[PDB]
Design a protein around this ligand. Structure first.
Ligand SMILES: Nc1ncnc2c1ncn2[C@@H]1O[C@H](CSCC[C@H](N)C(=O)O)[C@@H](O)[C@H]1O
Ligand SMILES: Nc1ncnc2c1ncn2[C@@H]1O[C@H](CSCC[C@H](N)C(=O)O)[C@@H](O)[C@H]1O
Ligand SMILES: Cn1c(=O)c2c(ncn2C)n(C)c1=O
Ligand SMILES: Cn1c(=O)c2c(ncn2C)n(C)c1=O
Lengths: 330, 333
C-alpha cells in the first residue's frame, strides 16, 4: 500500500517539478524544497532522489551547471531524526539536507524562499482532537466518524479540519516564492462514500477491538466513549473549498483514488490479514498506547489481528487518497 | 566551570561580531542566517541562539525597524544526538532552528547566504589521523604517545601541523563560498601558546590518557605496539599558525585574534578529590568515544579508572591549565 501510494503519485511530483523548470527556478543559485511530516522511513529519501534526478537530468539538456538543492525535512520534535540522518548517510554533492523540527501548523521557514513543498500522509492529522465532541460525550461507540455517529461529530471534525488546513495553507503561502508549487497527498474519502468501514477502516476496526476490551470489562466504557482520534479524511471537494477561500493558490491538479488496503501480491487470506493489521498497528500504535497503556494496547492489537483476518475472508477493505497540487499566485 | 568559563569569556566577542553585522544593515534584510559548526547536544547552542536573538531584537527596537527573521543552522556529524537537542529546544517565534548533519570539512549550505558563522571547541578535530606517523620500514614514530609530546620526533609535529593546514583550509574555503560579503565568522578552539613546550602544558588530556594506556601496557593488558601506532586526530594550534593559514586564504580579513590560558579544573571546589574526579569526568566525556572505539569497552573502563587516579594526584601538586585560541574573520573580495 505505502509502495502503491508513492509510486502512483511520483508522476504528479515530477509534473510539479517540471512546472518549476518553466519558471527557470533551476537557473537560480539554490532550489529550496520542504517535506511536511517526513517521519523517518524511505519516502523522504525518494522525494530527495526524485527532485535531484529531475534537476540533474534537465541541466544536462540545457548544458548549464545545476542549481544547488536544499531540502528541509520537517516533522514534530519527537520524531526520530537520529535514525533519519543516519540512513541519509548511505544524496550528497550539491545537496544540503536539513531537519526542521516543529508543527506545520504555523511558520517553519523564512518568507518566500520555498520553490517546492511536498507532503504525503501527514496533513490529515489535526492539531488537536476537535472541540464539540462533548458535558457528556457525543460519538459514544467510536474513535472517529462512523455509521453510528450523530451528525454533530461529522460537523465538528470538518470544522477542525477547515481551521487546521487553512492555517497550513496560510503558513506555506507566506514561505513560498511566487509560482512555487505545493504537492499534498493525504488519506481521504470519495464524497459519495458513506462513513464507517468504507473510508475509515482502521478507526472502525480499532473501535471494535476497544469494544471487545470494554466487553471483557478490562476498559471503562466511558473511556472509549470520550476517546477520539485527531484525524480527518476529507473529500476532494472539501479540500478544494478550503483552498478556494485562501486566495493565494491556484489549483493545478486534484485527484481521488481508491485501492485495496491489503497487499495484492499475497494469495493467502491469512498473512494478508496479519500484514494489514501489522500495517495498521505501525501507524496507530503510539496514539493508542498513550491512551490505554502498554498492557491493554498489546491486547487490543491481538484482537485487531483476529478482526482483520476475518474481514479478509469476506469483504476486503479499501483505502482512499486525495491529492492536490497548488501554485502560489497574487 | 571550564566550559562555562570559555563561553562566558568569549560571549563579548560573539556580540561584537553580531554588532558588525548591524553596521552592514544585515538586520534590514528579510532573514538573518546563522550557522553553528559542531554544535553537539549540550547547552552551548541554546546560548548562541539566545545571544543572537536578544541582540537582534534589542537593536530593531533601537533603530525602529522591522526585525529580520532568524534562521539558525545547527551543524554536527550525523549520529550526533539531534533527537535530544530538538527536544530540549522545545522548552522560537520568527526563529527557525534547523539540524544540518554532515562534516564541516566540505559544503553544507547554499552559496553566499550565511551572515554569521560560529564554532566553539570543534574545529580542532581533524578529518583523519595525520599521515606519515609510520616510517618507510613500517615502524611507528611517536612511540609513547597519542598526540604531540616532549618525546615526539620532529616529523610528528610537522605531520599534525600539515593535516591541520589541510583541514582548516578546507573549512575556510567551504565557509568562504557560503558566506555573504561582509559576513563574520567566530572560531573558538583548543590551542596553545606558541612559546609553550609540547606535553602537559598544552595537551594535558592527551598526556594523561597516554599515561593511563601505558599503565595498561605495563599490566600487559594491551600490546605496546597498539599505543605506539595509536594517534588522536586532534591538533592544538598557536594563533600564529591559525593566522598563517588564514593569510593564504585570500577571502577573509582578521578582525580579532586571541589566546588565553585558564586552570582546567573547576576552581570553585575546595576538595582536591572532587576537583580531580570532575576534571577526569570532563576529560572522559569528550574523549570516551575515540578511546572506546580503539580499545573496546572493557579496557576503556579500566583506562578511565586509572585516569581518575592520575588527575586526582595531579590536583594535589601542580594543577593543569588549558589554552584557547579565538579568531574572528570578515568575508571580503
Ligand atoms: N503538525 C505536524 N507537524 C509536523 N509533522 C507532523 C504534524 N502532525 C503529524 N506529523 C507527522 O506526520 C507524519 C505522518 S506519517 C507519513 C510520513 C511520510 N510523509 C511518509 O509518506 O511515509 C508523522 O511522522 C507525524 O509525526
Ligand atoms: N567535521 C566535523 N563536522 C561537524 N561536526 C564535527 C566535525 N568534527 C567534529 N565535530 C563535532 O564537534 C563537536 C565538538 S564538542 C563542542 C560542542 C559545542 N560546540 C560546545 O561548545 O559545547 C562534537 O560534537 C563533534 O561531533
Ligand atoms: C502513515 N499512515 C497514516 O498516517 C495513515 C494511513 N492510513 C490512514 N492514515 C491516517 N496509512 C496507510 C499510513 O501509512
Ligand atoms: C570537546 N573538547 C575537546 O575536544 C577538547 C577540550 N580540551 C581540549 N580538547 C582537545 N575540551 C574541554 C572539550 O570539551
Amino acid at each position: 500500500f505505502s509502495q502503491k501510494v508513492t509510486s502512483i503519485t511520483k508522476p504528479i511530483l515530477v509534473n510539479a517539478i517540471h512546472s518549476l523548470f518553466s519558471e527557470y527556478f533551476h537557473r537560480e543559485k539554490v532550489l529550496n524544497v520542504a517535506d511536511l511530516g517526513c517521519a523517518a522511513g524511505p519516502n523522504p529519501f525518494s522525494v530527495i532522489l526524485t527532485v535531484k534526478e529531475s534537476l540533474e537530468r534537465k541541466c544536462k539538456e540545457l548544458n548549464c551547471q545545476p542549481a544547488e538543492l536544499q531540502v528541509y525535512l520537517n516533522d514534530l520534535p519527537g520524531n526520530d531524526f537520529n535514525s533519519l540522518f543516519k540512513d541519509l548517510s548511505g544524496v550528497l554533492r550539491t545537496c544540503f539536507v536539513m531537519g526542521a523540527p516543529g508543527s506545520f501548523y504555523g511558520r517553519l521557514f523564512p518568507r518566500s524562499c520555498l520553490h517546492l513543498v511536498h507532503s504525503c500522509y501527514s496533513v490529515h492529522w489535526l492539531s488537536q482532537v476537535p472541540k464539540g465532541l462533548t458535558g457528556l460525550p457525543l460519538n459514544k461507540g467510536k474513535i472517529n466518524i462512523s455509521k453510528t455517529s450523530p451528525p454533530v461529530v461529522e460537523a465538528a471534525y470538518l470544522a477542525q479540519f477547515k481551521e487546521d488546513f487553512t492555517l497550513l495553507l496560510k503558513s506555506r503561502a507566506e514561505e513560498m516564492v511566487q509560482n512555487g508549487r505545493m504537492v499534498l497527498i493525504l488519506n481521504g474519502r470519495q464524497a459519495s462514500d458513506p462513513w464507517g468501514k468504507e473510508s475509515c477502516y482502521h478507526w472502525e476496526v480499532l473501535a471494535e477491538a476497544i469494544s471487545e476490551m470494554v466487553s471483557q470489562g478490562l476498559v471503562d466504557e466511558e473511556k472509549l466513549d470520550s476517546f477520539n482520534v485527531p484525524c480527518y479524511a476529507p473529500s476532494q471537494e472539501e479540500v478544494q473549498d478550503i483552498v478556494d477561500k485562501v486566495g493565494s493558490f491556484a489549483v493545478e491538479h486534484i485527484e481521488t483514488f481508491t485501492l485495496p488496503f491489503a497487499n495484492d501480491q499475497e494469495s493467502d487470506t491469512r498473512v494478508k490479514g496479519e500484514q494489514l493489521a501489522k500495517n495498521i498497528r505501525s501507524f496507530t500504535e503510539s496514539i493508542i498506547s498513550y491512551e490505554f497503556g502498554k498492557e491493554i494496547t498489546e491486547k487490543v492489537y491481538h484482537k485487531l489481528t483476529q478482526i482483520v483476518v476475518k474481514d479478509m475472508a469476506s469483504r476486503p477493505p479499501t483505502n482512499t487518497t486525495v491529492v492536490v497540487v497548488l501554485s502560489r499566485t497574487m
